[PDB]
Curated annotation (Swiss-Prot), chain B:
It comes from the Bacteria. One of its GO terms (molecular function) is magnesium ion binding. One of its GO terms (biological process) is mycothiol biosynthetic process. The keyword Membrane does not apply. 1D-myo-inositol 3-phosphate binds at residues 11, 73, 105, 129, 145. Signal peptide: none annotated. This is D-inositol 3-phosphate glycosyltransferase. Mg(2+) binds at residues 284-285, 287, 311. Catalyzes the transfer of a N-acetyl-glucosamine moiety to 1D-myo-inositol 3-phosphate to produce 1D-myo-inositol 2-acetamido-2-deoxy-glucopyranoside 3-phosphate in the mycothiol biosynthesis pathway. It comes from Corynebacterium glutamicum (strain ATCC 13032 / DSM 20300 / JCM 1318 / BCRC 11384 / CCUG 27702 / LMG 3730 / NBRC 12168 / NCIMB 10025 / NRRL B-2784 / 534).
Length: 396, 399
């Protein structure tokens, strides 16, 4: 398979959308899919073709000056950049099986090219005018055109799908949820003092053992499994120097915790943004993920990227997200006893647990965006299998 | 010869009532020659539908790209790819193949540039206005537009301009290669230049029973204003008491007042400062005859403006003038440039009120039918040369 990704207004080669595009493309290429990322040329020294990795290139198209053309003026270069892409493809004798365009400017480019090339257009908006003037009204119109014309609308979340339905009357049948990987730059162990800093912020002594839960507080994410497992641990041996932190949004669990006499061992933390969530993962010795359903396992990968080993239920994408015996453990089912057993084993074996947290970082870096790319590759194959483009239907 | 042209006019429809007139007038005249022209524009009026049949060989294609109203010219760049894609979709549904593209104004040129590469056919581009000429040492968006106009200067196969001044403007501001520039002269503005004359003679202080001869043009020898002056001296030699006054308008390359003084006719000849087209209507209207004693005259625009105004023309039998003037119907044609031939021709029309007035009336339809005809004739030549010398690889793209 040969994929043309389009990122007109921003190069994936500078240090959210940039890392999404680079990471997914890098991971697709690892799988043997050829990806060319097309971007406007901005850096004379890069040349036209940047060979990034096996199967992965960035193509720099001249359309307007290298500098001095702002994002707001980039619509003027829509046709020129499209023509520049086409001219490249002719000089180079390259053909593609599918286009994945990113942000509305690239969608507009990709829409023209999908008709010409007679191949599917996958489109990811990243941000939307209706979720955020004559400028913004013009952008919204273009985003609506992509809603009404692209073959697949790829969104990051269920919320994004809902924003497309509400604001753009998008057909839910054309929407596919493709979950991004863990932000491995944000979620990192930090320096030698970083875990100390996190503990201090949260008011937790350095010597205490900490188990954390992160996620929406609803029964299919199993926070009740953790709570009941903690009660069982304390029933077995009340002397644990153990605290639990649960973060933390409603879809009750404290009522549950006090019923079981563990409400002074489990603190509920309010949901917080990613930059604040790093401290939770860092302060934790173990992250427990007792999901009944888990497509994906983003929390598990955020925890591992942060250097914290994971005890996960053996469900969904969790056996992939956690390297069993290397970066954490997998639990069969959801009994409080089996969860207490796994927790005790990692809590009492410091040497193994610490090594697992250290190994978790490189595991996340190699494997978090890899599951996003498997989703994309699956979605691409389906779009191609079901491809009918005659270039005649154009809802302008 | 079998020929089909796509004209591109994204931001403005030929079907409403500047560029509009040029596009519709050139397309219409080209269609009369048996060239099939489709003018592509953004859809703005549901009632028109997709395809408008204007005349035999002439269609307007309305392409949906954004809302039919509420999208200003300034936000139109956001629809560049959508409109190009929409054009392409129409061509696939309709199964129509083109031989040449003629784009108008930078937005359409950008569309035409992509397509000319895809189809490997020439792009002829008319700017009509330019950011660098309008503005001067501007905003982020005037700058973006200028860059796009510069791309078209550096990529289009032919740059068609209205005048020599526009050619110079392209050379100065955009470093345009003069070998890629062709001057294509627009036809006479037959709305502005129309008969409506008493009011004109009051405006110009011409009283009022008198017979008047006007000259309009650059006051340089290849336009022959000296020929008229010497012809007028000869007339007054024949009849010291003749009917006649002369108005010369105007603009240096005062040779000619001193010349009129030398020949003893300075009182019967008046020199008017050049003026805008608005003001120039009055001079054509005040005149009974317009004299065009050119030695060189590619086009005959003054002749056509005079005719449109309902004033018959006496012209030298040179260049584009025997086409511009219907000889013996809307004026006279003079062989050579002797004062005596010119005095003969003047006297023939001054002394025959009935034929002169009839010629003036016939002149109006002649202009309204024939002025953009010469424009479309040079376009057809230009289009043929562009196709004969076509060299579009689809690969060279100076973005």
């Amino acid at each position: 398979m040969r994929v043309a990704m389009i990122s007109m207004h921003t190069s994936p080669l500078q240090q959210g959308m940039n890392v999404y595009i680079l990471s997914t493309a890098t991971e697709l290429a690892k799988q043997g899919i050829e990806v060319d990322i097309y971007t406007r040329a901005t850096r004379p020294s890069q040349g036209e073709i940047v060979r990034v990795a096996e199967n992965l290139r960035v193509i720099n198209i001249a359309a307007g000056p290298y500098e001095g053309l702002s994002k707001e003026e980039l619509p003027t270069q829509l046709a020129a950049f499209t023509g520049g892409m086409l001219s490249f493809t002719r000089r180079e004798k390259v053909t593609y099986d599918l286009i994945h365009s990113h942000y509305w400017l690239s969608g507009q480019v990709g829409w023209l090219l999908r008709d010409l090339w007679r191949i599917p257009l996958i489109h990811t908006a990243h941000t939307l005018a209706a979720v955020k003037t004559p400028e913004s009204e013009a952008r919204r119109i273009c985003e609506q055109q992509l809603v009404d014309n692209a073959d697949v609308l790829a969104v990051n979340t269920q919320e994004e799908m809902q924003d497309l339905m509400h604001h753009y009357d998008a057909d839910p049948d054309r929407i596919s949820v493709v979950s991004p990987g863990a932000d491995v730059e944000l979620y990192s162990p930090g320096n030698d003092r970083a875990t100390e800093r996190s503990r201090r912020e949260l008011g937790i002594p350095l010597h205490t053992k900490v188990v954390a839960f992160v996620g929406r507080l609803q029964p299919f994410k199993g926070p009740q499994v953790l709570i009941k497992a903690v009660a069982a641990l304390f029933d077995r041996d009340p002397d644990r120097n153990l605290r639990v932190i649960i973060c933390g949004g409603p879809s009750t669990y404290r009522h549950m915790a006090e019923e079981l006499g563990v409400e002074k061992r489990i603190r509920f933390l309010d949901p917080r943004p990613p930059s604040e969530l790093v401290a939770v993962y860092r302060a934790a010795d173990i992250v427990a993920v007792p999901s009944f359903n888990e497509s994906f396992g983003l929390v598990a990968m955020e925890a591992q990227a942060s250097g914290t080993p994971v005890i996960a239920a053996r469900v969904g994408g969790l056996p992939i997200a956690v390297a069993e015996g290397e970066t954490g453990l997998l639990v069969d089912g959801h009994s409080p006893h089996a969860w207490a057993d796994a927790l005790a084993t990692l809590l009492d074996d410091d040497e193994t647990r610490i090594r697992m947290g250290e190994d978790a970082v490189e595991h996340a870096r190699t494997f978090s965006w890899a599951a996003t790319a498997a989703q994309l590759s699956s979605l691409y194959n389906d779009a191609i299998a079901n491809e009918n483009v005659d270039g005649e239907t154009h809802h302008g």
